[PDB]
Write a protein that holds these residues in place. Sequence first.
Motif, PDB file in Angstrom:
ATOM      1  N   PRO A 291      66.722 -59.414  -3.560  1.00  0.00           N
ATOM      2  CA  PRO A 291      65.282 -59.467  -3.525  1.00  0.00           C
ATOM      3  C   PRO A 291      64.535 -58.576  -4.517  1.00  0.00           C
ATOM      4  CG  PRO A 291      66.063 -58.108  -1.711  1.00  0.00           C
ATOM      5  CD  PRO A 291      67.288 -58.663  -2.399  1.00  0.00           C
ATOM      6  N   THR A 292      63.264 -58.875  -4.693  1.00  0.00           N
ATOM      7  CA  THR A 292      62.410 -58.083  -5.523  1.00  0.00           C
ATOM      8  C   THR A 292      62.283 -56.734  -4.814  1.00  0.00           C
ATOM      9  OG1 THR A 292      61.196 -60.110  -6.050  1.00  0.00           O
ATOM     10  CG2 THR A 292      60.256 -58.024  -6.810  1.00  0.00           C
TER      11      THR A 292
ATOM     12  N   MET B  80      58.880 -53.869  -9.157  1.00  0.00           N
ATOM     13  CA  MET B  80      57.427 -53.928  -9.329  1.00  0.00           C
ATOM     14  C   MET B  80      56.922 -52.777 -10.222  1.00  0.00           C
ATOM     15  SD  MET B  80      56.193 -56.350  -7.095  1.00  0.00           S
ATOM     16  CE  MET B  80      57.262 -57.072  -8.519  1.00  0.00           C
ATOM     17  N   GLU B  81      57.453 -51.570 -10.056  1.00  0.00           N
ATOM     18  CA  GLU B  81      57.109 -50.494 -11.010  1.00  0.00           C
ATOM     19  C   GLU B  81      57.548 -50.961 -12.407  1.00  0.00           C
ATOM     20  OE1 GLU B  81      58.070 -49.811  -7.904  1.00  0.00           O
ATOM     21  OE2 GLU B  81      56.495 -48.449  -7.191  1.00  0.00           O
ATOM     22  N   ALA B  82      58.724 -51.568 -12.528  1.00  0.00           N
ATOM     23  CA  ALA B  82      59.217 -51.975 -13.866  1.00  0.00           C
ATOM     24  C   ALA B  82      58.359 -53.039 -14.551  1.00  0.00           C
ATOM     25  CB  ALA B  82      60.671 -52.478 -13.742  1.00  0.00           C
ATOM     26  N   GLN B  83      57.856 -53.959 -13.727  1.00  0.00           N
ATOM     27  CA  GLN B  83      56.985 -55.038 -14.192  1.00  0.00           C
ATOM     28  C   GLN B  83      55.610 -54.519 -14.529  1.00  0.00           C
ATOM     29  OE1 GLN B  83      57.044 -57.998 -10.999  1.00  0.00           O
ATOM     30  NE2 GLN B  83      59.127 -58.729 -11.564  1.00  0.00           N
ATOM     31  N   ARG B  84      55.132 -53.551 -13.777  1.00  0.00           N
ATOM     32  CA  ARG B  84      53.884 -52.932 -14.104  1.00  0.00           C
ATOM     33  C   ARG B  84      53.997 -52.282 -15.494  1.00  0.00           C
ATOM     34  NH1 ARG B  84      49.827 -53.044 -11.310  1.00  0.00           N
ATOM     35  NH2 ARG B  84      48.512 -51.185 -11.083  1.00  0.00           N
ATOM     36  N   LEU B  85      55.086 -51.549 -15.754  1.00  0.00           N
ATOM     37  CA  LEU B  85      55.326 -50.913 -17.072  1.00  0.00           C
ATOM     38  C   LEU B  85      55.343 -51.931 -18.219  1.00  0.00           C
ATOM     39  CD1 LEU B  85      58.098 -48.330 -15.846  1.00  0.00           C
ATOM     40  CD2 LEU B  85      55.899 -47.745 -16.986  1.00  0.00           C
TER      41      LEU B  85
ATOM     42  N   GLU C 100      63.306 -53.565 -26.537  1.00  0.00           N
ATOM     43  CA  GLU C 100      64.121 -53.497 -25.331  1.00  0.00           C
ATOM     44  C   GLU C 100      63.234 -53.879 -24.136  1.00  0.00           C
ATOM     45  OE1 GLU C 100      67.291 -51.411 -26.315  1.00  0.00           O
ATOM     46  OE2 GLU C 100      67.821 -52.978 -24.844  1.00  0.00           O
ATOM     47  N   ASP C 101      63.783 -54.595 -23.167  1.00  0.00           N
ATOM     48  CA  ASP C 101      63.013 -55.079 -22.009  1.00  0.00           C
ATOM     49  C   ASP C 101      63.246 -54.108 -20.834  1.00  0.00           C
ATOM     50  OD1 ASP C 101      61.849 -56.493 -19.785  1.00  0.00           O
ATOM     51  OD2 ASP C 101      63.340 -58.043 -19.821  1.00  0.00           O
ATOM     52  N   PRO C 102      62.165 -53.514 -20.287  1.00  0.00           N
ATOM     53  CA  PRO C 102      62.206 -52.553 -19.187  1.00  0.00           C
ATOM     54  C   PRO C 102      62.513 -53.134 -17.832  1.00  0.00           C
ATOM     55  CG  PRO C 102      59.925 -52.897 -19.912  1.00  0.00           C
ATOM     56  CD  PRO C 102      60.790 -53.724 -20.795  1.00  0.00           C
ATOM     57  N   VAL C 103      62.346 -54.440 -17.659  1.00  0.00           N
ATOM     58  CA  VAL C 103      62.607 -55.086 -16.380  1.00  0.00           C
ATOM     59  C   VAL C 103      64.108 -55.323 -16.327  1.00  0.00           C
ATOM     60  CG1 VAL C 103      62.220 -57.074 -14.867  1.00  0.00           C
ATOM     61  CG2 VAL C 103      60.329 -56.201 -16.314  1.00  0.00           C
ATOM     62  N   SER C 104      64.608 -56.032 -17.305  1.00  0.00           N
ATOM     63  CA  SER C 104      66.017 -56.281 -17.438  1.00  0.00           C
ATOM     64  C   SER C 104      66.806 -54.964 -17.620  1.00  0.00           C
ATOM     65  CB  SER C 104      66.192 -57.104 -18.677  1.00  0.00           C
ATOM     66  OG  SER C 104      67.530 -57.508 -18.766  1.00  0.00           O
ATOM     67  N   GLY C 105      66.233 -54.047 -18.394  1.00  0.00           N
ATOM     68  CA  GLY C 105      66.812 -52.716 -18.597  1.00  0.00           C
ATOM     69  C   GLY C 105      66.949 -52.007 -17.267  1.00  0.00           C
ATOM     70  N   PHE C 106      65.919 -52.103 -16.419  1.00  0.00           N
ATOM     71  CA  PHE C 106      65.977 -51.477 -15.121  1.00  0.00           C
ATOM     72  C   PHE C 106      67.080 -52.083 -14.277  1.00  0.00           C
ATOM     73  CE2 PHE C 106      64.815 -51.090 -10.645  1.00  0.00           C
ATOM     74  CZ  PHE C 106      64.848 -49.716 -10.524  1.00  0.00           C
ATOM     75  N   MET C 107      67.131 -53.408 -14.234  1.00  0.00           N
ATOM     76  CA  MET C 107      68.143 -54.095 -13.433  1.00  0.00           C
ATOM     77  C   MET C 107      69.548 -53.717 -13.826  1.00  0.00           C
ATOM     78  SD  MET C 107      66.602 -55.543 -10.926  1.00  0.00           S
ATOM     79  CE  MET C 107      68.235 -56.351 -10.270  1.00  0.00           C
ATOM     80  N   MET C 108      69.741 -53.402 -15.091  1.00  0.00           N
ATOM     81  CA  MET C 108      71.077 -53.079 -15.595  1.00  0.00           C
ATOM     82  C   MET C 108      71.379 -51.586 -15.423  1.00  0.00           C
ATOM     83  SD  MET C 108      71.951 -56.076 -17.206  1.00  0.00           S
ATOM     84  CE  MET C 108      72.556 -56.353 -15.377  1.00  0.00           C
ATOM     85  N   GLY C 109      70.415 -50.814 -14.943  1.00  0.00           N
ATOM     86  CA  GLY C 109      70.600 -49.388 -14.786  1.00  0.00           C
ATOM     87  C   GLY C 109      70.448 -48.508 -16.021  1.00  0.00           C
TER      88      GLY C 109
END
Lengths: 116, 116
Positions: free
Chosen positions: B64-65, B101-106, A83-92
């Motif tokens: 935005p980011t 940025m926290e998500a990308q760091r993770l 699972e991707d945490p960046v995309s996961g984050f964006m999706m809530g």
Amino acid sequence: HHHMSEAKELIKKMCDLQNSNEEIQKEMAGWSGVVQYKLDGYYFYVEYKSDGTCEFKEGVHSSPTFTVVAPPDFWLAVLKGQEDPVSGFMMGKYRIEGNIMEAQRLAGVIKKFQGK
Amino acid sequence: HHHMSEAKELIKKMCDLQNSNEEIQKEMAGWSGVVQYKLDGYYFYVEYKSDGTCEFKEGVHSSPTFTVVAPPDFWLAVLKGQEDPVSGFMMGKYRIEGNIMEAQRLAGVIKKFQGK
């Protein structure tokens, strides 16, 4: 055997692996901070030290760099690369408390224009 | 002559300097994103491109980011190195919207444990 503490146990295994691996330590060196986790009731944090070593700690740090609040099953899947945490984050699919990393990113970019 | 748009004008000057300086570009390369600024009514953003170049844009980006919401006089002082944005943030002198940025760091830390 499905159980909610597996994500925590893997973060702990990864702290042991980080502290046992000379190459990961070199990649992590230069930064210090604390990541607090809250996975459905499991409260624990990882302190990152600037020598690239870390420490897994039980409970709650009074002042972390940032906090990950997520369902344990989703976080496990993230840890295992399912699972991707960046995309996961964006999706809530989870949330994050803290913006100090945005602030540090700003400070570092500003640094490059110092004296120009 | 004190005026509220000086912080904006300096960010713009710094985009021109970034795009004119081969060494800053190399330091910024490898990342793409958008920083939105809101300085008492002045709305503008900087798009960062992975070749280490950037673009200063008027108005508001729909996604935005992260976003910096700050008083212009404080942000000017930060830009000129008279004020620290990390410590300033901790004290509540401005605010930040966005945790990508926290998500990308993770995501990047997890990457190192992939296949181990």
